[PDB]
């Protein structure tokens, strides 16, 4: 497959907890804000329930901060081309009813160029995916994965599978 980013499985990650939030992970940047003063638990764990390879991250939810952003892994860099029509698609599940997860694309300013807001993560598997276009001149653009909801308090996050493809 070609896809924009990097290690959209995790394939490439060690299991166990990442403390390294910013380059532990390679495609990717883990970030929590600190108005998040018990801090989440980020996770590889390799699992024979992984919709892709062995591994998926796993995201437990503590506390929570100001805005649901102060929790997010960001998958980066990741590649396209200026006009470019892409198919973003994830898989994600919870351990407990009720989590809430926004899948977002937008470039190194932080213009947005789409997302899935508020989405309704259950307990089993699902893909959620978008389109979106490539609507200024840039080709090192982010996707921004935002779990910071008060919802998701106690609950752990499960992705795995971000592919980004032209459409
Ligand atoms: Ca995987």
Do not use: C
């Given at each position: 497959?070609?896809?924009?980013?990097?290690?959209?499985?995790?394939?490439?990650?060690?299991?166990?907890?990442?403390?390294?939030?910013?380059?532990?992970?390679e495609?990717?940047?883990?970030?929590?804000?600190?108005?998040?003063?018990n801090?989440?638990?980020?996770?590889?764990?390799?699992?024979?329930?992984?919709?892709?390879?062995?591994?998926?991250?796993?995201?437990?939810?503590?506390?929570?901060?100001?805005?649901?952003?102060?929790?997010?892994?960001?998958?980066?860099?990741?590649?396209?081309?200026?006009?470019?029509?892409?198919?973003?698609?994830?898989?994600?599940?919870?351990?407990?009813?009720?989590?809430?997860?926004?899948?977002?694309?937008?470039?190194?300013?932080?213009?947005?160029?789409?997302?899935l807001?508020?989405?309704?993560?259950?307990?089993?598997?699902?893909?959620?995916?978008?389109?979106?276009?490539?609507?200024?001149?840039?080709?090192?653009?982010?996707?921004?994965?935002?779990?910071?909801?008060?919802a998701?308090?106690?609950?752990?996050?499960?992705?795995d599978?971000?592919?980004?493809?032209?459409?």
């Amino acid at each position: 497959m070609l896809v924009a980013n990097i290690n959209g499985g995790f394939e490439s990650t060690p299991a166990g907890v990442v403390t390294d939030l910013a380059e532990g992970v390679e495609g990717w940047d883990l970030n929590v804000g600190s108005s998040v003063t018990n801090p989440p638990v980020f996770e590889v764990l390799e699992t024979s329930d992984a919709p892709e390879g062995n591994k998926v991250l796993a995201v437990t939810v503590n506390g929570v901060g100001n805005n649901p952003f102060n929790i997010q892994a960001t998958a980066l860099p990741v590649n396209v081309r200026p006009g470019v029509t892409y198919t973003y698609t994830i898989r994600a599940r919870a351990e407990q009813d009720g989590a809430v997860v926004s899948f977002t694309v937008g470039n190194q300013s932080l213009d947005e160029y789409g997302r899935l807001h508020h989405q309704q993560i259950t307990t089993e598997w699902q893909p959620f995916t978008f389109e979106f276009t490539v609507s200024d001149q840039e080709t090192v653009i982010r996707a921004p994965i935002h779990f910071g909801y008060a919802a998701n308090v106690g609950n752990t996050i499960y992705i795995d599978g971000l592919a980004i493809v032209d459409l």
